[PDB]
Amino acid sequence: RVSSGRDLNCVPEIADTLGAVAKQGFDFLCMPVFHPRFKREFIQEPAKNRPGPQTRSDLLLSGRDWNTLIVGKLSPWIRPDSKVEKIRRNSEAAMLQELNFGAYLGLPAFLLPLNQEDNTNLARVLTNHIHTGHHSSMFWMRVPLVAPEDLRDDIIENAPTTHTEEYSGEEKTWMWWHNFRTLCDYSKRIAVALEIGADLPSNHVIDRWLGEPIKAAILPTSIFLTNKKGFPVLSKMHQRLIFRLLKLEVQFIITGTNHHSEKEFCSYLQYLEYLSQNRPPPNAYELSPLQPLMDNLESQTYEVFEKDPIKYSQYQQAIYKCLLDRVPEEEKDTNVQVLMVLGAGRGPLVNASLRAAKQADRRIKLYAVEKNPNAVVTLENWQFEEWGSQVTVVSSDMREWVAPEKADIIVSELLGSFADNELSPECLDGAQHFLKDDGVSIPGEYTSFLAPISSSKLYNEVRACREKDRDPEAQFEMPYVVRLHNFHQLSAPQPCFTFSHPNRDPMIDNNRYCTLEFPVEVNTVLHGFAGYFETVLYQDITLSIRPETHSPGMFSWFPILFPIKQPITVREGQTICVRFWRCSNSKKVWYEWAVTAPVCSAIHNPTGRSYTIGL
Amino acid sequence: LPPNAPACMERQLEAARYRSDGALLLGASSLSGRCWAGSLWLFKDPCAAPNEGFCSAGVQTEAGVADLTWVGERGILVASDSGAVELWELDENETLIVSKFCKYEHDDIVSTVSVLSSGTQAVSGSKDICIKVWDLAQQVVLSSYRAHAAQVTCVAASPHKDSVFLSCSEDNRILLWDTRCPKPASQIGCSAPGYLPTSLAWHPQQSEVFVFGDENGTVSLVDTKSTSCVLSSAVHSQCVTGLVFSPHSVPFLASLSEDCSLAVLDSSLSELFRSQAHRDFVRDATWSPLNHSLLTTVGWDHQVVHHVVP
Ligand SMILES: CN1C(=O)[C@@](CCC2CCCCC2)(c2ccccc2)N=C1N
């Protein structure tokens, strides 16, 4: 369903008005805490000594009603950035008065307007209110998609509207939000209440709001069209924006009087509910945003990583093809192919290898190697109750285990967000000694990819991960497991590093260094880099989490995020240059990264001070 | 007290208008307390105001009143907070105030209204940035204009032209309108952008000149043909809320402000009279049709002061 509210700048009877909007079907109400025309004086006599009350009582609604049904509104006369010092000083005290009253009522959100370029003093008064007593209160900034100056009708004779293309000028409203958000030091309590106009701007303007903290979407009655029945509807372009906003789970707000007088306000809400009940169908991937790389791995953590039928059906086909290619029809019963499952886990690859041998109709001798003794319990119980003498469970590290015979095929996997998955090159290098001279490794190739991303929401989430007894900026020097739905990609992903198994080099060095140049054709703000990977199990049988070559049905593998301490402003035509290192000692493996264009950033995670994966 | 009239008048007085025969019209709004609604009042005796028990006619409107204007001798045009323009007509014996139409067309609060010279058409300015031309007989909107970029502060119809009118907003624009043009709006005023315009007043003798007040307390005289500001005076210390011309052959300009003071200026904008009787914001002013030296002013302090202008 649609979580929606009604916006009203006129409330004569607070009890009767709330009953009218609840009857219409609205969940909450955007109303003013003080009368919009009631201009108060605070310095000049005798208007400052005006007899009270200054507004209506808090007793008129119950505590639960103020906490869940009423969203505050700042009075329109309050202009803290006015050219007149008297209006400026009076608006400062009135803003504090209205913000403190909103906190006193315990309102879940408070609406403040961004209708001009300069809101520096409105930013100071709000930043001061937030730093005066901790609260769960939210602040929604009313920002339009198109400024009213660029929306006005061309009816002024000696002042015509600009018809020429102005790429940066069309994005000025985002600059109003960004400058205000920057001044307030990226407060977790300041969000966007995006106001949609009659005519939508170009795609790049709407795309600039991707990754921004949009918590509300304001829709005026003026933007609604009249269908061939007399009911309020929306254009196909306006409908496209509603589908995008519904996926972000924003609270839709209805503003303005009923222009469809022959109908009612309930029909405007019925059309939004009609859009959600008939929105595009979701996929298996669609059915906190960031989680760090897991190293504990419990029974349920192994279970959710095993919830990938597409991954093991590919592994089955990869082993099935390798068996027929290694042993012909004449050696069907006389030749036994020794298979070694390195990192056996709870037996998902083992069962897939057994299903492949029955499919290929070839003889196999299985060895199930696993370091985790908790997972070995599941393997040894599986072997005794189902597998038998065919599968030999080994409770040892693949790098230190002494095998009784050389292997024909070695099978390994990366499961979920396990931190030790990054050690795959070193783990397979210490296991290839007990592999035959003509032996095959499944997978045989791994190729990683990097892409520049923009997400002001994810940047503030990493920023909130500050911990005591460690560097206050350590959170930006470590990778995170994030969903593709959150961030906005700035350029096509490019190859970062490749690993081939078995490694034939006489002097194997798993250390890497690449310089990637990404062309950016939009005005944006860089917050970090997303990492994807492609794997070649056997010949044409592959698995990929890269957005272009993504395997349909995959759910266990999520992209990795490498954030940056300070976000970098990127212009149209500019190039993002990233420097990435994969570093490895004789004990630890870590990642290092830095930005060299358009502007320079500090090298992240030097010597792995914030993050390392122990071998 | 008359029937259907409210028991108590609302504290904040928004409008004061004198009818041709000398009847006083009052607009009251409750900008604080439990109820945030408005009320319309008629007083055949000017000295009887603000006493509720001794009024000719009274009624309570759905929401608060922001601006008023006489539509002849029986019609009353209301600028409501609900975003509606209301038309209330008087009784045969003028004892009741009955509603003719309540059309909700403006998305936000209707802050200003002005009836055109014909008396059959009226212009309305609202916080929704829009300006609407209304048909008082057909009860519908003729044209909807979105020429400004901020809330419309004041709309004033020309004294004797049905197509010409002035409109000012918080976007620092003073627009001279003429519906006879394909592009009706025309940006007029000072050369360099100064302080925001708050009040507009057409000259009753010279239909080509007008006066405007800003947010800093300055009143300026401007000719539409000359389009270059030459005469200006720092009248008040706070925002100029209203400006009203006297009915004299040589008109006097009554200046209103939030600094709780009333000022009377000549033609060269020089101070002739100044009253500090109001202890709160001075909202409206109207010169008496019988005695042209009498000026009635209202405020948010619930005071209906009568001044003697020399
Ligand atoms: C989701 N994810 C990645 O895309 C990847 C590549 C996996 C990596 C392949 C080679 C062998 C070891 C593992 C990465 C790491 C660094 C840069 C780009 C991508 N690691 C994680 N967790």
- Give kind and range of the element (H or E) at residue B199: strand B197-202
Look up residue A609 and give its amino acid: R
- The atom of ligand 1 lying closest to the CA of A414 is 13
Q: Could you report how far apart the first and last alpha carbons of chain A are, in Å?
A: 48
> What is the spatial distance between Cα A509 and Cα A500, in angstroms, rounded to a whole number?
12
- Give kind and range of the element (H or E) at residue A380: helix A373-382
Q: Cβ of A59: how many Cβ atoms within 10 Å? A: 6
> What is the spatial distance between Cα A528 and Cα A565, in angstroms, rounded to a whole number?
9
Please state whether the peptide bond connecting residue A46 to the residue before it is cis, i.e. omega within 30 degrees of 0. Answer: yes
Sign of the C-alpha dihedral, residues A15, A17, A22, A27?
negative
- The atom of ligand 1 lying closest to the CA of A558 is 1
List chain A residues with CB under 8 Å of B215. Answer: 82, 84, 87
Residues 27-66 of B with CB under 8 A from A: 29, 31-37, 62-64, 66
Measured in angstroms, how far is the CA atom of residue A310 from the centroid of ligand 1?
20
Number of H helices, E strands in chain B: 0, 27
Q: How many residues does chain B have?
A: 310
- Give kind and range of the element (H or E) at residue A98: helix A85-105
Q: Is B193 on the interface with A (CB under 8 A)?
A: no
Measured in angstroms, how far is the CA atom of residue A577 from the centroid of ligand 1?
19
> A149 and B107: CB-CB below 8 Å?
no
Strand partners, B40: B27, B59
Closest Cα of chain A to B150: distance in Å? 7
> B238 and A86: CB-CB below 8 Å?
yes
> What is the spatial distance between Cα A273 and Cα A519, in angstroms, rounded to a whole number?
40
Elucidated via: X-ray
Alpha helix segments (H runs only) across A421-526: 424-429, 456-463
What is the maximum alpha-carbon separation in chain B?
A: 55
Measured in angstroms, how far is the CA atom of residue A448 from the centroid of ligand 1?
6
Structure tokens at A410: 């070695």
The SS3 of residue A233 is strand
HSE on the CB side for A65, CA within 13 Å? Answer: 10
Q: Could you report how far apart the first and last alpha carbons of chain B are, in Å?
A: 35
> A44 and B81: CB-CB below 8 Å?
no
> What is the spatial distance between Cα A368 and Cα A380, in angstroms, rounded to a whole number?
10
Measured in angstroms, how far is the CA atom of residue A422 from the centroid of ligand 1?
6
- In sequence order, which residues have a C-beta less than 8 Å from that of residue A195 and are 6 or more positions away? A142, A143, A144, A145, A218, A220
CA geometry: angle A575, A576, A578, nearest 5 deg: 140
Mutate to test the pocket of ligand 1, among A533, A558, A604, A613 (most ligand atoms within 8 A of CB): A533
> What is the spatial distance between Cα A584 and Cα A613, in angstroms, rounded to a whole number?
9
Closest CA to B259 of B276, B244, B242, B243: B276
Please state whether the peptide bond connecting residue A36 to the residue before it is cis, i.e. omega within 30 degrees of 0. Answer: no
CB A589 within 8 A of CB A615: yes
> Does the beta carbon of A450 lie inside 6 Å of ligand 1?
yes
Sign of the C-alpha dihedral, residues A596, A602, A607, A611?
negative
- In sequence order, which residues have a C-beta less than 8 Å from that of residue A404 and are 6 or more positions away? none
Closest Cα of chain A to B244: distance in Å? 21
HSE on the CB side for A409, CA within 13 Å? Answer: 31
Strand partners, B233: B219
CB A116 within 8 A of CB A69: no
Structure tokens at A60: 């008129």
> What is the spatial distance between Cα A142 and Cα A501, in angstroms, rounded to a whole number?
55
- Give kind and range of the element (H or E) at residue B142: strand B140-145
Q: What is the DSSP letter of A260?
A: -
Do β-strands A232-233 and A435-442 pair in parallel, antiparallel, or remain unpaired? Answer: unpaired
List chain B residues with CB under 8 Å of A60. Answer: 34
List chain A residues with CB under 8 Å of B183. Answer: 154-157
HSE on the CB side for A420, CA within 13 Å? Answer: 16
HSE on the CB side for B180, CA within 13 Å? Answer: 7
Closest CA to A110 of A136, A146, A131: A136
CB A590 within 8 A of CB A612: yes
> What is the spatial distance between Cα B129 and Cα B145, in angstroms, rounded to a whole number?
9
**Burial class of residue A407 in the structure, from the number of CB atoms within 10 Å of its CB (0-12 exposed, 13-18 middle, 19+ buried):** buried
If phi over 0 gives left and psi between -120 and 50 gives alpha, with beta otherwise, what is residue A46? alpha
> What is the spatial distance between Cα B270 and Cα A461, in angstroms, rounded to a whole number?
62
A298 catalytically annotated? no
Closest CA to A112 of A62, A208, A24, A187: A187
Residues 98-137 of B with CB under 8 A from A: 104-109, 111, 127-129
Measured in angstroms, how far is the CA atom of residue A533 from the centroid of ligand 1?
6
- In sequence order, which residues have a C-beta less than 8 Å from that of residue A468 and are 6 or more positions away? none
**Burial class of residue A162 in the structure, from the number of CB atoms within 10 Å of its CB (0-12 exposed, 13-18 middle, 19+ buried):** exposed
The full set of domain ranges for chain B reads: 1-310
Q: What is the DSSP letter of A383?
A: I
Closest CA to B39 of B80, B1, B100, B72: B80
The SS3 of residue A331 is helix
The SS3 of residue A534 is strand
Among A152, A155, A258, beta carbon nearest to B183 = A155
Report which protein residue has its CA nearest ligand 1's atom 16: A531
CB B198 within 8 A of CB B239: yes
> What is the spatial distance between Cα B305 and Cα B286, in angstroms, rounded to a whole number?
11
Closest Cα of chain A to B216: distance in Å? 7
How far, in Å, are A403, A488, B88, B104 from residue B99 at the CA level?
98, 56, 4, 14
List chain B residues with CB under 8 Å of A74. Answer: none
> Does the beta carbon of A416 lie inside 6 Å of ligand 1?
no
A386 catalytically annotated? no
Given the residues A413, A426, A461, A477, the one annotated as active site? A413
CB A449 within 8 A of CB A532: yes
> What is the spatial distance between Cα B258 and Cα B215, in angstroms, rounded to a whole number?
10
- Give kind and range of the element (H or E) at residue A356: helix A348-360
> Does the beta carbon of A367 lie inside 6 Å of ligand 1?
no
| Residue carrying structure tokens 């921004």 | A212
- In sequence order, which residues have a C-beta less than 8 Å from that of residue A203 and are 6 or more positions away? none
